[PDB]
Write a protein that binds this DNA or RNA. Structure first.
Ligand code: MG
Ligand code: ZN
Lengths: 152, 567
RNA sequence: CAUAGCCCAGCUUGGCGGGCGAAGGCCAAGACGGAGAUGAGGUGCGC
């Protein structure tokens, strides 16, 4: 049914918005970290002959992580504020997708868990030195509401 | 017009596999497995009938006793090795081996002498085998969903395999058929029926959308190869992206077709006569690669008359820049393409050369082996970690059944771990992350651990095939010998070079001559003296008994091959 | 997730541009009979 197709389309749309919000939140954290002059200097520094470069690159990579740890406490409020900002924006998507949309709330809840599950895996994965991330997945194709009319 | 040719066409990787094709491969697997089981049953019946003869019974009892003595002496030798932690006992074991071989010869003789008596029994069993196969066909086709062409292809593969195994058992290794697990990789086929007094199934007939085979196989957009060789590679590879309609099979008594995206690189000559088309599905590192093969009949080529005689010789002696896999000599100077001059070396006169394989093949295969070892160690680490977690925690149901540490401890193949991981994608358990963190990583490695190998091996094959071409370009006659250390020989593998050279010479019509290489290496070309010692040749060069000067054994080999040819 | 390999219209080799389980392909030289990884015995599927 077209209702089924539209719900999936809304489901695909919601994930992109959540992915879009995450990277901006991810970028905001990067901007928050880059505020410290020590962090910025390391990032510029970060920016047989193979081994020497690799060693210096990771040392620069480690130093940037080292600078993150020392000033982690002093930036906790700033990180939380953007974290609170992300939650509010994520809350706003519920109104647009569910309160003002025909998407089923169970579908939103399920995807929200999946993204939140995904970021937890991702966040620790990048920590030790093993990088990977969310990227935009292209759309490929009770049953919620329909102009406020529930359909089955 | 007798020669058969087979042309390959690749399938698009962004092509899925329909449900009908999976059903066909599943049925083909089941047929092959029942056939293997019946083959083993038939072999067991034959062995029992052989054993029925009291002389054969006595010979078999003697053989069993000799085998028991041999294994007992092997156990004693193993115990002596363990106690020494690393000659008379070995001599006793050798005596037991000799006795076992003598008993085996006696058993073979006993079978041979009474062979004419159980011929009726053997024929009756074979007839029952044929009847069982016919019943299988009646089930799979007359009452099943298999297409009769695929059944014929599987039967032909099976009967080829049984002859291979019988030859191996006659020629040594007591190998046998082994059941296999349905990984999802198989073979399907379609035949082209041409009754008597019928027009040739021309490739142009196939491209017709209203042809006599529009319901069986249809490859639109054929081109004459004479025009084809002038089209640029651009329009060539853009023109070949075509859509093959193929009869695939029936489901609930309804024919089903598939529409493969294929990229055709060479077309068939207009006078050809197609025979059949077989679709092969291969699995490598969890990627379904497919390939369509078309077989036809083509007129032969006139054999050449002019062209220097070229002699080839094989080895596996090493060289600093790669394995030195062959040495060739020519009657007259030869021309070697510039793109191969670093693989097919040539001398000053142009009549002699060395074929080496660049060492990059060896390095890549070594990388594959090291990735295999590292994968094994990481596999063990994951096994230990999952066992520990299972011991210390609850077990969420897998396949709706509790998981036990003993069963997990007995796993050796990655397959069980993979299925469990895909089962626990999102259980939320930490082990699941531990069970996914491994998984993804290895499939990156698994790809490499396989693909590189094939890719690397492909490269080597290419060189050999290319070499074949150049010789058939000039040679009026080609001669071949009838001939870590083993690993290097498994990497270079001159057997491939011999097979490719013979195949190319057959296709091009050049005469191939198998020289009797008997008493050649011990023979020096210049001094004409044989050398009885069989250990001096392990190094190069070797001193000559009849002349007292070191010489190239391979160069003398090719010189002798040419001399014997030039008689 | 290792630090260079693998993949992105048959195959191998080069070159341009991309992807790390997903994407995105383009160009050039050459060659080409499909039918061999002991890892399994599941009685449909390493998604
Ligand atoms: Mg290709
Ligand atoms: Zn001599």
């Amino acid at each position: 049914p077209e209702v089924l197709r539209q719900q999936l389309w809304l489901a695909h749309n919601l994930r992109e918005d959540l992915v879009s919000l995450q990277l901006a939140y991810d970028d905001d954290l990067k901007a928050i970290w880059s505020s410290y002059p020590d962090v910025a200097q390391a990032e510029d520094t970060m920016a047989q002959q193979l081994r020497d470069a690799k060693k210096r690159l990771k040392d620069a990579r480690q130093a940037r992580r080292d600078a993150i740890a020392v000033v982690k406490d002093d930036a906790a409020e700033r990180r939380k504020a953007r974290s609170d900002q992300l939650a509010a924006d994520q809350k706003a998507l519920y109104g647009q997708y569910c309160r003002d949309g025909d998407l089923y709330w169970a579908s939103f809840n399920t995807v929200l868990d999946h993204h939140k599950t995904a970021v937890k895996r991702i966040a620790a994965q990048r920590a030790s030195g093993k990088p990977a991330t969310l990227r935009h997945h292209r759309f490929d194709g009770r049953c919620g509401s329909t102009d406020g009319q529930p359909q089955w | 017009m007798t020669t058969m040719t087979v042309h390959t066409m690749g399938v698009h990787y962004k092509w899925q596999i329909p449900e009908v094709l999976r059903q066909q491969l599943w049925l083909a697997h089941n047929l092959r497995e029942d056939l293997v089981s019946l083959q083993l049953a038939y072999d067991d019946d034959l062995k029992a009938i052989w054993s029925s003869y009291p002389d054969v019974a006595q010979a078999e009892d003697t053989m069993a006793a000799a085998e028991a003595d041999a294994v007992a002496l092997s156990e004693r030798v193993k115990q002596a090795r363990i106690e020494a932690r690393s000659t008379e006992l070995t001599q006793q074991l050798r005596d037991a081996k000799k006795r076992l071989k003598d008993a085996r010869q006696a058993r073979r003789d006993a079978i041979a002498v009474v062979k004419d008596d159980a011929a009726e029994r053997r024929k009756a069993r074979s007839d029952q085998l044929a009847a069982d196969q016919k019943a299988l066909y009646g089930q799979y086709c007359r009452d099943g969903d298999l297409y009769w062409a695929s059944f014929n292809t599987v039967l032909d593969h099976h009967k080829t395999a049984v002859k291979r195994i019988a030859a191996q058992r006659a020629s040594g290794k007591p190998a046998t058929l082994r059941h296999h697990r349905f990984d999802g990789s198989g073979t399907i086929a379609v035949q082209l029926q041409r009754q008597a007094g019928a027009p040739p199934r021309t490739p142009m007939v196939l491209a017709d959308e209203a042809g006599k085979y529009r319901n069986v196989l249809h490859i639109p957009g054929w081109t004459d190869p004479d025009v084809w060789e002038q089209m640029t590679r651009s329009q060539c590879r853009q023109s070949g992206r075509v859509t093959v309609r193929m009869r695939c099979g029936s489901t609930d008594g309804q024919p089903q077709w598939i529409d493969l995206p294929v990229q055709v690189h060479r077309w068939l000559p207009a006078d050809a006569d197609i025979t059949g088309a077989e679709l092969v599905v291969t699995r490598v590192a969890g990627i379904y690669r497919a390939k369509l093969c078309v077989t036809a009949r083509i007129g032969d080529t006139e054999p050449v008359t002019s062209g220097p005689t070229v002699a080839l010789h094989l080895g596996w002696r090493s060289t600093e820049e790669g394995t030195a896999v062959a040495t060739w000599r020519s009657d007259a100077p030869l021309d070697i393409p510039f793109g191969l001059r670093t693989v097919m070396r040539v001398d000053a006169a142009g009549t002699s050369g060395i074929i080496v394989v660049p060492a990059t093949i060896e390095r890549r295969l070594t990388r594959t082996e090291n990735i295999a070892s590292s994968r094994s160690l990481a596999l063990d680490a994951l096994r230990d970690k999952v066992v520990g977690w299972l011991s210390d925690n609850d077990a969420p149901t897998y396949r709706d059944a509790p998981l036990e540490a003993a069963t997990v401890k007995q796993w050796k193949s990655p397959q069980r771990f993979a299925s469990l991981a895909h089962a626990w994608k999102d259980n939320g358990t930490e082990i699941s992350d531990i069970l996914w963190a491994w998984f993804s990583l290895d499939r990156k490695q698994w790809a490499q651990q396989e693909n590189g190998r094939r890719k690397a091996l492909g490269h080597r094959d290419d060189l050999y095939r290319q070499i074949a071409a150049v010789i058939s370009d000039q040679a009026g006659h080609v001669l071949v010998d009838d001939t870590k250390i083993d690993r290097r020989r498994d990497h270079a593998a001159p057997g491939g070079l011999r097979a490719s050279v013979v195949a190319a010479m057959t296709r091009d019509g050049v005469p191939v001559t198998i020289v009797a290489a008997a008493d050649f290496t011990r023979t020096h070309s210049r001094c004409g003296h044989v050398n009885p010692a069989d250990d001096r040749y392990l190094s190069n060069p070797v001193r000559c008994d009849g002349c007292g000067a070191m010489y190239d054994q391979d160069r003398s080999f090719v010189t002798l091959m040419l001399r014997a040819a030039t008689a």
